[PDB]
Write a protein that binds this DNA or RNA. Structure first.
Ligand SMILES: [Mn+2]
Ligand SMILES: [Zn+2]
Ligand SMILES: [Zn+2]
Ligand SMILES: [Zn+2]
Ligand SMILES: [Zn+2]
Lengths: 98, 1407, 96, 49, 49
RNA sequence: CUGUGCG
């Protein structure tokens, strides 16, 4: 790097985005959709090609934004794994011949 | 020839005889447009002169082929054969051998005669030597300076004792008391028997007073059947102009039958229909309103209905079958177009409403008029509203199509109206007014105004007027009210004086509007000049002789009395009469400029043509050079050359020691010689050492012509406020000659310094010098020159340029002006065609021009049709040449003033009027002799000082701009009237754009913020009256100075849309999205041309795609797209009598180099009601049918702005004309970010409390931070269009271009914000940013009152990064640390190499 | 993705919002994720705002959120005197 | 520099003038604009004493 | 291209000149990639030779 | 070349 590791120290990038998001949330109730994420200045997380580290907790929604998702909101609490430890109550039904 | 007439069904010049009629086709081929038009007109003339002899008929056709195009084989033996033929001529006559090659190269190659081509013959005809003997016999130009100085000393000594001490000076002191007495004597008529009441004298004012004080004292399913009647009336008027019948009379009779059947159908099925709503709605005494604005007697209506059904049975059946089969969309008529309309019920209805018929007083006392002065503030506004309604009814009366009278006629003193048209104007809840008239078209009529309170038609009066002269007060009932209110507030310094001058001002404005006449305009201009002379100290002796205007009517006497009384009330008095004289001068100047309220549209075209011909020919007859029909070729006879040489000698026989010749046209030869001598040896402020030399079939030429015409012009007028200016329309060749002389003189003037006619830099310099001179107490002389055109002569410019050095910048060779002198000699022998209408009016007919016409009719020769003279340079023909002459002569006069009177003069001319700022060494009584001597020297030249010229140390005037000590007069009424007038309504978007430009240029000159919003309301009401309906765009209402200062039309539209979206939660979101997109594109990243692909879809998909860059999901996108507005111009432009965007049109207009305003508005309202809205498939439909597909949504989204903003589902029936208003807001915000910075993204905040007395005027500068590289050349927009839209750059663009090479070789390739921000302009037909980017501010300064800036909305740019980007202190310290720590590893040179090659050298950034 | 795969009887419901840095699914607080600002970032955020009452709300809701965080690194020096430009003594004396 | 030794209020006064803030002003105009208000209505600044 | 670059670098031993050219190229690339304003003026500047 | 539009 020609900047001698002085550009923004991406840790500062993500913590500044988190602080902007939190301090803008604490002025009025806002939906945590992509609208209140893409319309933020410090949402440069789409930059920084090395995407090994996201902000604190929304890593999956940023990874989906890398796929350009149009989602809005759900239970994004993957700390308790929602893809793992899932009931497997599986079954089948009859058919209808064409 | 064969190939040419084969295209027009011709033979093998061409005869086609069939029966008893012959078609004669004559053709010619001339590639030069000059000779093309010449042969065209000659062929037309010699073919039209023959039918006069053959008729005692023929079809004449002339075919001029501008090239040699053929269709025989292919483009091979057409030009090669001619080329080899002229080659053979070269290998083996003289003038024809040159004609054959000069006639065909392309149009210009060795053919276009620029000012370096005197190689035709340079031959004499036994007349040029005598001309030069009478033109260049006294010119020496090599006179020394000391001799000129002592001659001027002796001349001043002679003038001071022979012309000045004798009292023969043309200028005198003011004597303000005597000035006021003379004003009261000339304007305030005391010997006239007219009453002291404007309503008694003016019939229209009487009618307005009657209607007002009869509507304010009486009153000011009930409204269901009236609208039904209006709807079926509109439907019947729709089928009136489709020609769905054979004869017009049958059409009118069938529509009458439909209306009568509607009447009889409404009579029943209701308790009291005609006695309750017709009497209260649209019905008059015994007569009913019909189509074509007519009102027909019910009696005679049913009498006419009895005919054509008894004498022509079975008429209704086929007359309805021909309508149903022709238009099965207007078949809403179900029980009207039926059999006999129940005649007995009809006659019972008629005998029910038996009232007196309108009288229509045709023939032109007690003064019960309540003394308008003592009227409440409400009755005056009611008078203005009544005037507005009556003027709109007049305009609509001019709208009536030419119909025919179905009744027999019996205009002497009275006419019992039965077949008259009427315009109905709604006034109050119960009473409505009617305007009856019997004529159509645009001519002056005799109207009769009546009222209807509850059916009792009371006569309000009858008057005579021209309809096309009442367009200004049509909807400006509040604009003029606000104008008068602010003018009265200007006089707040004297609580009491404003109280008398307010009602007088309102009455004067009302009388001016109710009587628009050229005499009132002339009188108010005279009052302007009188005030200009009153404020200063020295004025011409013939001033008051020019302020008088013959009234010829009491309607002029009343307005003159009002104006003079206002001037006296503001000026008269002994000591306490000039308290605030700046406010008084501003008030009186605006009152005098109120003449612009009256339109300038030639009340009588033939009369004004006669007056123009009189003004054109009177100086020639008074001089003695009026040769008629000399040769029309250039071969003058003996008497013609004799009278021309006599005119030249008389023009150059003015001595320097005679005062009895300071008024006849001419020039002193010795004074002109002194002028040229002082100009040559660099003695004057302008020097002959010029730069950029201006030098850059007509086979045989001479001093008279060139055998390609005789420099033929044609006389006409130009509509102006005071008097119609002269105008000369010339043919192609003479127009090219004028263009040549104009370019030469214009380049010479650009080489000069003090000339300001087409150099805005020099005009601004003159403005600043005049301002500082008036602030320092210098002697400002605002000089005007009377009869500049009619007295200037091309021979004078010849005598000037005969000895002008005009040295080159690098060569110093005294370039010869032989070609310039030749074309000026041609101008000297020009031929001015008199108007044919003037001739035919003089043949069927005391006047000097009429006397000359009678004398030259048959006594000397034949009917006069052409006029040649030595004097009377055409106004606008030698404009820059006259400017050069006037500048040289005025610099000579300034040198003479410095020489004799030891003053410091600096002058600025404009070829019509000039201003001389004279700094005096060491009142203004000792400088009177200097002014008289200057005027005497000017009269010794052809610079006769007009009596409208003023000299003083208090106020100056130049180019209709008045400058005052410490400020500048805003000229409020002039700009307000310009905003109300010149409404060229072609497209409502163009209408609003022009109105917005006018309002911006008026706010620049400190008009108001409360008057401009009323002008915008008037324009929006005009657009809404045309049936177009209100659109989210258009005139900006409730605006602030910040919407005009540091704000373009795009920002005004953005503010309008924001005002539409109160409690901005949606437009704020769109602004945030636009700020995100702009931070993404400006910040660089990757955003150039994918936006162009995303925008080209339209408004819906483009807005969705731009929202998909933000996190707008299918929830927020649908919430944004819910706001729609009906766009009539969606599939192109409205049809009015491949649709590329207007950006291409403005580019084509920028690269390349008579009808009244009321007629324009009539045509606008007429075309806005026909099939104008296009549906994409080529089938135009009405605006009513578009707006009829709307549904009652009322779901809190269609209620924030009714009839402007609609829902998505509320336009399901008509979805093609449904565009997102928020997409337009996004585009406008992005373009405002382009043009004038980032502050268009922040939310609007207001000042809290702010006391500036409404008069704290000051100049403010535009605070724009434009980021478009500040150049924005044409070759940048062209290149961007070529890159982005190549298929649109090839077709519809650059067919007429030869500089594609510079636009192709990457001329500053990829300017910032010229790819998406040009797409937003190309796709939005109402945005138009590139038109503003390819232009200057045109104001550069805004005079505004501090009361508006204290109320100005606060909206500044705010960084979106929350001051977190890099904290530029950190930027610079990091760069310093990098530099130091890289220096401390090896010795490095501190050049720019070791600075630019460093990463953290972002110091070039951070603006 | 969140898409219900081209069909479903239930769609476009359960919106997640944010009021005090705490995820509210329908009104129930899930948790708060730690965020540090070190004070200077706080005042830099306070600078670029809309109006007065917005500043009041954002500064009154700060220390209640700071209860769910641990950050005393904010400079208690002249920086605080600069923040004093917004006289909101009630707000800093409300959390106690 | 001040004005041209003119009252700038009545436009016709070159005698014993008093400067307001940047221009000149005569006695009667000064007293008239002082006895009704404290502002100048010409330069819009407080009048001298 | 990288092979030719390495060949030219081997031509320029003790690289003080090719290193300077590489630094200039890195500056130009940081200016164009980083975005700023560098698209088509370079095309006009290169076409000369 | 064609208008029904001041509420
Ligand atoms: Mn003038
Ligand atoms: Zn009267
Ligand atoms: Zn709705
Ligand atoms: Zn005074
Ligand atoms: Zn003052």
């Amino acid at each position: 790097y020609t900047d001698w590791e002085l550009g923004l120290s991406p840790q500062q990038i993500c913590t500044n985005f988190k602080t902007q998001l939190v301090l803008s949330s604490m002025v009025n109730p806002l939906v945590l959709s992509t609208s209140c994420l893409k319309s933020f200045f410090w949402f440069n997380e789409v930059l920084e090609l090395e995407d090994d580290s996201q902000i604190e907790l929304a890593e999956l929604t940023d990874f989906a934004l890398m796929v350009k998702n149009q989602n809005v909101s759900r239970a994004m609490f993957v700390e308790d794994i929602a893809m793992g430890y899932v009931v497997s109550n599986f079954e089948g039904v009859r058919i209808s011949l064409s | 020839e064969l190939e040419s007439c084969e295209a027009h069904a011709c033979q093998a010049d061409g005869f086609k005889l069939t029966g008893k009629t012959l078609i004669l086709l004559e053709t010619f081929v001339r590639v030069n447009p000059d000779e093309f038009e010449k042969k065209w007109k000659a062929d037309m003339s010699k073919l039209l002169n023959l039918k006069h002899d053959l008729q005692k008929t023929l079809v004449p056709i002339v075919d001029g082929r501008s090239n040699y195009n053929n269709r025989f084989v292919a483009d091979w033996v057409i030009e090669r054969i001619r080329w080899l033929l002229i080659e053979i001529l070269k290998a083996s006559e003289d003038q024809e051998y040159q004609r054959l090659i000069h006639s065909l190269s392309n149009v210009k190659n060795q053919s276009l005669g620029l000012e370096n081509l005197e190689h035709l013959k340079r031959n004499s005809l036994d007349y040029d030597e005598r001309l030069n003997e009478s033109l260049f016999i006294g010119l020496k130009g090599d006179i020394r300076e000391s001799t000129v100085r002592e001659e001027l000393i002796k001349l001043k000594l002679w003038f001071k004792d022979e012309v000045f001490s004798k009292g023969l000076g043309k200028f005198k002191l003011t004597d303000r008391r005597e000035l006021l007495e003379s004003l009261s004597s000339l304007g305030a008529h005391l010997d006239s028997d007219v009453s002291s009441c404007p309503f008694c004298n003016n019939k229209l004012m009487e009618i307005v007073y009657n209607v007002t004080f009869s509507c304010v004292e009486r009153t000011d399913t009930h409204s269901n059947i009236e609208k039904h009647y209006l709807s079926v009336l509109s439907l019947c008027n729709k089928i009136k102009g489709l020609k769905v019948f054979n004869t017009r009379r049958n059409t009118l009779l069938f529509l009458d039958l439909i209306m009568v059947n509607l009447m009889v159908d409404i009579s029943d099925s209701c308790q009291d229909a005609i006695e309750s709503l017709r009497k209260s709605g649209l019905i008059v005494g015994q007569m009913v309103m019909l189509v074509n604005d007519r009102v027909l007697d019910i009696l005679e209506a049913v009498k006419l209905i009895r005919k054509k059904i008894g004498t022509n049975p079975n008429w209704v059946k086929n007359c309805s079958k021909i309508l149903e089969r022709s238009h099965p969309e207007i078949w809403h008529h179900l029980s009207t177009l039926i059999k006999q309309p129940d005649f007995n019920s009809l006659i019972s209805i008629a005998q029910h409403l038996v009232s007196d018929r309108p009288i229509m007083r045709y023939s032109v006392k007690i003064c019960r008029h309540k003394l308008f002065q003592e009227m409440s503030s409400f009755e005056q506004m009611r008078l203005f509203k009544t005037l507005s309604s009556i003027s709109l009814s007049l305009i609509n009366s001019m709208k009536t199509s030419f119909s025919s009278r179905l009744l027999v006629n019996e205009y002497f003193g009275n006419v019992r109206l039965r077949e008259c048209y009427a315009q109905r104007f709604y006034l109050a809840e119960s009473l409505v007014g009617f305007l009856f008239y019997q004529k159509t078209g645009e001519r002056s009529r005799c109207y009769s105004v009546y009222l209807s309170d509850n059916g009792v038609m009371s006569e309000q009066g009858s008057f005579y007027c021209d309809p096309k002269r009442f367009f200004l007060p049509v909807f400006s009932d509040e604009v003029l009210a606000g104008m008068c209110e602010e003018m009265t507030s200007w006089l707040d310094f004297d609580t009491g004086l404003m109280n008398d001058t307010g009602p007088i001002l309102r009455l004067l404005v009302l009388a001016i509007l109710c009587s628009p006449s050229k005499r009132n305009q002339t009188f108010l201009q005279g009052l302007r000049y009188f005030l200009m002379a009153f404020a200063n100290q020295i004025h011409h002796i013939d001033l008051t002789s020019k302020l008088v205007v013959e009234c010829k009517s009491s309607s002029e006497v009343v307005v003159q009395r009002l104006a003079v009384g206002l001037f006296i009330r503001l000026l008269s008095g002994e000591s306490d009469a000039s308290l605030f004289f700046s406010r008084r001068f501003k008030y009186l100047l605006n009152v005098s400029y109120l003449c612009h309220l009256i339109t300038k549209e030639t009340p009588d075209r033939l009369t004004d043509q006669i007056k123009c011909f009189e003004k054109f020919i009177e100086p020639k007859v008074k001089f003695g050079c009026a040769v008629v029909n000399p040769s029309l070729n250039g071969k003058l006879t003996v008497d013609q050359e004799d009278i021309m040489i006599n005119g030249l000698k008389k023009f150059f026989s003015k001595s320097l020691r005679d005062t009895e010749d300071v008024q006849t046209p001419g020039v002193c030869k010795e004074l002109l010689n002194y002028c040229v001598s002082l100009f040559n040896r660099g003695k004057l402020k302008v020097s002959g050492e010029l730069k950029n030399n201006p030098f850059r079939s007509p086979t045989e030429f001479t001093s008279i012509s060139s055998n390609s015409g005789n420099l033929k012009f044609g006389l006409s007028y130009k509509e102006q406020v005071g008097s119609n200016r002269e105008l000369y329309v010339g043919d192609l060749n003479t127009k090219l000659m004028t263009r040549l002389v104009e370019d030469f003189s214009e380049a010479v003037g650009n080489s000069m310094k003090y000339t300001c006619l087409n150099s805005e830099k020099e005009f601004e310099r003159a403005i600043c010098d005049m301002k500082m001179a008036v602030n320092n107490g210098d002697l400002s002389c605002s000089y005007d020159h009377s009869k500049w055109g009619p007295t200037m002569s091309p021979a004078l410019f010849l005598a000037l340029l005969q000895m002008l050095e005009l040295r080159t910048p690098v060569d110093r060779s005294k370039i010869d002006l032989d070609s310039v002198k030749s074309i000026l000699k041609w101008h000297l022998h020009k031929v001015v065609e008199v108007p044919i209408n003037v001739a035919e009016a003089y043949c069927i007919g005391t006047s000097l021009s009429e006397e000359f016409f009678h004398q030259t009719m048959q006594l000397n020769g034949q009917i006069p049709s052409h006029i040649m003279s030595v004097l009377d340079m055409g106004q606008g023909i030698l404009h820059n040449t006259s400017d050069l002459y006037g500048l040289i002569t005025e610099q000579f006069l300034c040198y003479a003033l410095d020489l004799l009177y030891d003053v410091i003069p600096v002058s600025y001319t404009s070829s019509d009027d000039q201003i001389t700022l004279i700094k005096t060494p060491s009142d203004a009584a000792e400088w009177l002799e200097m002014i008289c001597f200057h005027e005497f020297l000017s009269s010794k030249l052809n610079k006769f000082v007009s009596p409208k010229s003023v000299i003083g140390t208090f106020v100056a005037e130049f180019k209709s701009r008045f400058f005052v000590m410490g400020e500048e007069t805003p000229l409020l009424t002039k700009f307000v009237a310009a905003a109300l007038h010149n409404v060229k309504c072609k497209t409502p978007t163009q209408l609003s754009e022009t109105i917005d430009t006018i309002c911006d240029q008026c706010i620049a000159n400190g008009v108001s913020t409360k008057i401009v919003t009323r002008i915008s309301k008037r324009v929006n009401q005009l657009i809404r009256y045309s049936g177009y309906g209100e659109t989210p765009f258009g005139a900006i209402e409730d605006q602030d100075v910040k919407d005009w200062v540091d704000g373009s039309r795009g920002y005004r539209l953005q503010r309008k849309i924001e005002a539409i979206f109160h409690d901005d939660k949606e437009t704020s979101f769109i602004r945030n999205c636009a700020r995100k997109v702009f931070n993404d594109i400006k910040r660089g990243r990757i955003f150039e041309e994918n936006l162009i692909n995303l925008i080209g879809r339209g408004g819906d998909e483009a807005l969705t795609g731009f929202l998909q860059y933000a996190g707008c999901s299918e929830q927020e996108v649908n919430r944004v797209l819910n706001y729609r507005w009906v766009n009539l111009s969606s599939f192109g432009d409205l049809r009015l009598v491949e649709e590329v965007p207007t950006l291409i049109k403005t580019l084509q207009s920028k690269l390349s180099r008579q009808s009244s305003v009321a007629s324009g508005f009539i045509g606008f309202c007429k075309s806005m009601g026909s099939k104008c809205v296009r549906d994409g498939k080529g089938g135009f439909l009405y605006i009513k049918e578009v707006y009829s597909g709307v549904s009652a949504c009322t779901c809190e989204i269609c209620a924030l702005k009714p009839k402007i903003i609609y829902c998505n589902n509320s336009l399901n029936k008509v979805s093609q004309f449904s565009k997102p208003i928020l997409w337009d807001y996004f585009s406008l915000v992005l373009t405002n970010a382009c043009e004038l910075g980032e502050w268009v993204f922040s939310t609007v905040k207001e000042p809290q409390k702010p006391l500036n007395n409404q008069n704290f005027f000051w100049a403010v500068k535009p605070k724009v931070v434009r980021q478009i590289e500040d150049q924005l050349g044409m070759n940048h927009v062209l290149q961007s269009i070529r890159r982005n839209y190549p298929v649109l750059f090839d077709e519809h663009l650059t067919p007429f271009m030869n500089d594609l090479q510079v636009s192709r070789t990457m001329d500053s390739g990829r300017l910032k914000f010229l790819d998406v921000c040009i797409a937003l302009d190309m796709m939005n037909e109402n945005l138009g940013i590139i038109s503003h980017l390819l232009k200057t501010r045109d104001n550069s300064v805004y005079i505004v009152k501090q009361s508006d800036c204290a109320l100005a909305h606060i909206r500044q740019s705010s960084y979106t990064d929350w001051e977190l980007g890099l904290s530029p202190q950190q930027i610079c310290t990091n760069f310093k640390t990098q530099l130091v720590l890289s220096s401390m590893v090896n010795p490095l040179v501190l050049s720019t190499s070791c600075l630019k090659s460093f990463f953290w050298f972002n110091e070039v950034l951070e603006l | 993705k969140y898409s219900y795969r081209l069909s479903g009887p239930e769609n476009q419901e359960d919106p997640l919002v944010l009021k005090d840095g705490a995820f509210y699914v329908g009104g129930e607080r899930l948790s708060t994720y730690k965020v540090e600002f070190t004070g200077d970032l706080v005042v830099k955020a306070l600078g670029a705002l809309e109006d007065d009452e917005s500043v009041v709300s954002m500064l009154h809701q700060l220390w209640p959120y700071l209860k769910a965080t641990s950050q005393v690194i904010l400079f208690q020096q002249e920086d605080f005197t600069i923040v004093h430009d917004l006289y909101k003594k009630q707000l800093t004396k409300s959390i106690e | 520099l001040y004005g041209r030794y003119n009252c700038k209020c009545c436009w016709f006064a070159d005698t014993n003038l008093i400067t307001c803030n940047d221009h000149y002003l005569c006695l009667r105009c000064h007293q008239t604009m002082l006895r009704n208000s404290e502002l100048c209505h010409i330069c819009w600044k407080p009048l001298p004493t």
